[PDB]
Assembly symmetry: D3
Homo-oligomer: 245 residues x 6
Amino acid sequence: SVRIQVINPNTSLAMTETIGAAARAVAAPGTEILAVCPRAGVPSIEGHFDEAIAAVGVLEQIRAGREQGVDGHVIASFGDPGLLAARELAQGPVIGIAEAAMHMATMVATRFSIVTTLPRTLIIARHLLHQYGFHQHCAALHAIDLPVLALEDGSGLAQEKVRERCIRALKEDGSGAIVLGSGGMATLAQQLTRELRVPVIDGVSAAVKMVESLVALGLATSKHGDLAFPEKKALSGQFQSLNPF
Amino acid sequence: SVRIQVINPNTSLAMTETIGAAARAVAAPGTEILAVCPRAGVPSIEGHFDEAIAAVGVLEQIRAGREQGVDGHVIASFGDPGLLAARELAQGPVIGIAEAAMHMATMVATRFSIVTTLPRTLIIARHLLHQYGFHQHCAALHAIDLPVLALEDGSGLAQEKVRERCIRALKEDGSGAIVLGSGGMATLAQQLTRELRVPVIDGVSAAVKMVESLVALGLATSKHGDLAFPEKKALSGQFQSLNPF
Amino acid sequence: SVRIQVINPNTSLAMTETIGAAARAVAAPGTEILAVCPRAGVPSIEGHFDEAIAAVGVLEQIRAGREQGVDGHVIASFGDPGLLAARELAQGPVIGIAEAAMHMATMVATRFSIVTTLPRTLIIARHLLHQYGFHQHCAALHAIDLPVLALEDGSGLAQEKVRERCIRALKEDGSGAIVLGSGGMATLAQQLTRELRVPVIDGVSAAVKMVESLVALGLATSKHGDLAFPEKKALSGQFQSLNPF
Amino acid sequence: SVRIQVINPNTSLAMTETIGAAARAVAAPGTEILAVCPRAGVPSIEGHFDEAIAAVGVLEQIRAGREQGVDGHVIASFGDPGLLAARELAQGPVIGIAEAAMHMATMVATRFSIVTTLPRTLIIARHLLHQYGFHQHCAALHAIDLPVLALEDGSGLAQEKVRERCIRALKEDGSGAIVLGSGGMATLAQQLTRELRVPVIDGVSAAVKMVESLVALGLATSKHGDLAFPEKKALSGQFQSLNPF
Amino acid sequence: SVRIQVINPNTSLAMTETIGAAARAVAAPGTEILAVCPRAGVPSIEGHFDEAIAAVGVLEQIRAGREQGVDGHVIASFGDPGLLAARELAQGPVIGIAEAAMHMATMVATRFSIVTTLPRTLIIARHLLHQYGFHQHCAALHAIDLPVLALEDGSGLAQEKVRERCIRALKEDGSGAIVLGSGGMATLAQQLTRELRVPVIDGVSAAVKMVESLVALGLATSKHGDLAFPEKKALSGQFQSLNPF
Amino acid sequence: SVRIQVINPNTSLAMTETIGAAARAVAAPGTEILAVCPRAGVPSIEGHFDEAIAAVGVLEQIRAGREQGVDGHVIASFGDPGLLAARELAQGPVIGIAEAAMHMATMVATRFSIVTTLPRTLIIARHLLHQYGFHQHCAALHAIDLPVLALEDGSGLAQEKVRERCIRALKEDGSGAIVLGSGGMATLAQQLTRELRVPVIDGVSAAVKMVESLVALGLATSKHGDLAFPEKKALSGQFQSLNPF
Ligand SMILES: NC(=O)NC1=NC(=O)NC1=O
Ligand SMILES: NC(=O)NC1=NC(=O)NC1=O
Ligand SMILES: NC(=O)NC1=NC(=O)NC1=O
Ligand SMILES: NC(=O)NC1=NC(=O)NC1=O
Ligand SMILES: NC(=O)NC1=NC(=O)NC1=O
Ligand SMILES: NC(=O)NC1=NC(=O)NC1=O
């Protein structure tokens, strides 16, 4: 059996449930999803300050996952907070949802467009594009100008704004696919794909498949050099529980 | 059930058997592998001239796969010949082995090294690095200075040269993983991974998992814009059978 | 005397005549133009599938040119299909028309705009910009949204649409020159240059001058390393005639 | 008067004293240095896991600095952990020591070389080079293969290894200046500059001057868009004290 | 005491006075500003021809500054003409105003917009962005379509056009700061910063602070390799006075 | 008839004669070469200071050429000093020898190596590679560590050092062609091409062919936007004769 810990980096249990449901919907036979969120942190991630807090919350759950002996990890917010930090701490592979969505997009289209939540998160997505090397593959980046948690507020306004922005993107951007720029849009991907007749990609589902793929290939994070286990040292105060290994 | 057509772009049946075996070894339950090679073409791909011939052979098999109604396709040589051409013709996703190996490498290491066959193929690998956007993620490229088919000649010389070059790469390059730069090295990946304690990645096995992943996600090649079906026109002579749809 | 084989990669004899006329119009004293097209292939090139077919047709004519002992070769479609493959097979220099037009544009302007045929060919032009290294030198890319062969249909609609798009480009793009993105626009270049008072560049005429230049300099394709003659191997079926040397 | 909070992101008081001394040595008349370190965290930063912990410790001190009404902030470790997060939280400018050292290097030399502590920190420095846009300005990156705190162990071994590596860099790399890749090397910069007759740059001292410069120019972090104050939300557990504003 | 030679590369005494006033307004206690312009040259710099003339005028003043034994130099036009040439000739640091403004902008914002004078100077600013490595940090470049000296013509039209363009930039570009693209806009920076509540940066004032910073750090131009004193040779005619050292 | 002004940017008449001879050796029937050098300037160009002086000397000769009504211009030193300035002033096309050599190299090889004079000129060549967009096409840059005028000193030492460095480059660099990095190496190109059996390219001869090509194509520098004639203004002192038009 394969056990994958899907970590929502924010403390919203509502978003954790949406992310968890999306992960189970595409999970292969024999795969168990462990949908979790940090005990302490931020309800939504909307900037660099929120990401720095989320990164430590991710590491808290990574530690818990490694203690449980899970096969892999997913970081389920579009900023992929603490990705490389998590890879150092974890033995199994760690996949970010932005990373996974962008990787899948290059396999089904020449260029993709990103539709995300707030304007101030666009720069974070731009940095990830350069970091992962997909900047040339991204035709345009768009924000719906609503807070992250608007996707969970029951109104359906954010979902409709994503839909409308996806249609506009396919007409103007010169792209063949859409990358959804939030973990909250996870369930909207399958509906828009069928409706718009183009790949509309959710990173949550994509990252699950990447972990499953790597485990089946017998591949895990390289412990040689850059992503080796953290150097042995004493952590103080609030951080002392992060590395008991 | 999932049916994946794994196309060896060269006409070597020996290499087709090695590629086919590697694909079946990692295939998920319910996945059938259709290992094929072109009826006409080149025995091995060792340059730009060979690639141009291989690309048309790929398209010949893509057509056959689409007629059979396969779920996806794999292009099983490290130059990914005719990748975008194949995506236009095929309905299901088409994944190159260089593409897949490089994508997996960025998920398990910060930087990777490439170990391939001939010096003259290095430029092709360099172009693909820039095209896919992984140039910054590649620490170094290496060639063992033996012809592609030396991996099939039974001597074990090419296999030992790959091993020795992998050890040297991990010591000098400042990389955490190895990408094997040939479809003939497909079976060597699992042995070197266990022996060297680092991810040594085969593109053949990786591409199979990518096709399986995309099919499970309900994602296929975008037929909107760049990778749309080829424009309706009459093909003459040797090419007339390529697009009966 | 200098003999230059100008290869139209598509099978349209009408386009071959337009390309041939443009080549002879700028040819230096003592230069003979051999305007040719493949015996088998595609009537027009409008995507990646068409390019893969065209590349082999180019190689067929390259072989014929080398047997005849021509001094150089021109690949006369804006995707420069099979350029590096042709350079391996040929002894004399091989120049693509996109390559040549872009090279000339950087010599007469700081930045240039591209005006081509179909929207789906734009990505091909974008890839060539990155491959040749002129991406920063290209201010914008534009398509007239008509099929390639509309330039040969006698209506004059495509020609007028190119004209109108050239005027708009010079006003909006912040560029000093125009690169015509088709072999069919070859004869329109001189008229628009005089009319718009800016360099409007045809790749066909430019590539002829590049071949003439290289021959006069006593320079041909390097047979050391990457562009060396293809490795000796047996080609099967439809490809057996490609390398009799 | 100008008050600058210099934050050592690690919990080593020994390194905090070295950093504090370097800051006061170059401080302009009327400038008070507030040398601090986090109450909880990691003794030294040697990888991505350490950086994620350090980033939150930085934010803890940023909050304290803003409450005190300081004019600016310095992040005094070569990974510039939590730089953009700190800029969101703080009103005054926040300057990283890697950022500052690299900025100064481009003003006194065409290209610079980096001499840092551990091999595994090189990738972090490489990422910062790309992020800040100085990758082309960096000729080479070097590590002395000793832990960060070796600079504080009293042996003088790390200091001598830095010296020897600086001499080798100036001979081999083709660079005109050296950037010291640690906050612990802060006091070594002035000695090597005089001895080697080239700019050997400490980021700590450089960042102090940048804060002083920006304050004198009447410039602070832009609160429009990306680096605006964090969105109002409730932080839980260990993070609740980070944003009382 | 610190003496900084601020060189206006154009021969406009009116612009020299504006530049000189801006330099003195931010100068630290003990700093003397030597505001100068060339004896021969061009009244305003509006293209590549003007820049080549200005570069030699800069060198003329650099020589004068070095003879006087000044601590540093500022090149006070947005094209930074003869920057590297000046660094070779001078002993003290030489800072360009475009260089300094761009460097400061990356410290207070994620991305910046440029507002300059003429459309034809935009390409010069684009080249400097690539040369200094801040191309990714620049969201947009804008020109007010008025000659450089319009800022000195007393009408206030150019100043109002800069203001209006700054407001439009902050609304459309997705940037957090403005870089003023002329030495004539030097005094407008402080007013727009207070009015628009964002960093509006003048390169003249910024470059002064950079020179002061480098002098306090005990850092000057590297005379090892690329920016070494010019090779000893005899200059003829109009240039004979440029290198008496 | 076609008249091409070949400008040696340095004041060495010996180098002017070598450059002039190389230009006439490849000149087409009907082409007259006007080999010139500035009346005032520097005997050799070995750094940024020398280039700034050379640029104005180029403009002096450009003015003379335009008054004479020449068809085009060549800037015959490997730094292409004042290239864009010259294009503004001149009506006919202006081609740099570094520009031309690099352009030809991409047409005959995948990657090229540069062999130049002094180590301190390498950075200038590196900047031109980035500016022209051929950085990825350049495998390596090499300097023979002799002054520029050593090629004219009659010893044959510099010529032998170029030869030896060319052989080493072809063995180590992984390149297919050599670009000679000086106007003094102009006559060595044909001998090394025949001897080493690879393209060894002289920029002087290449630039002549580019001017001839552009004239035959009826193409000249764009006077729309960036390379328009310099704005009408009064030049003072030593520069007053530069723009009488
Ligand atoms: N919406 C985003 O851009 N990032 C996110 N913030 C979250 O809290 N979850 C996300 O995916
Ligand atoms: N070895 C390679 O670099 N490319 C290849 N040529 C082949 O025939 N198969 C390959 O994978
Ligand atoms: N128009 C293009 O973009 N490419 C072309 N297709 C052709 O058939 N000829 C071309 O030049
Ligand atoms: N030495 C480094 O590369 N980074 C650092 N780790 C620390 O603890 N301080 C540093 O400057
Ligand atoms: N306005 C500019 O873009 N450049 C300049 N020309 C000048 O004369 N001074 C400048 O700053
Ligand atoms: N050798 C060079 O790199 N540049 C040059 N200096 C000159 O004087 N002529 C050149 O070509």
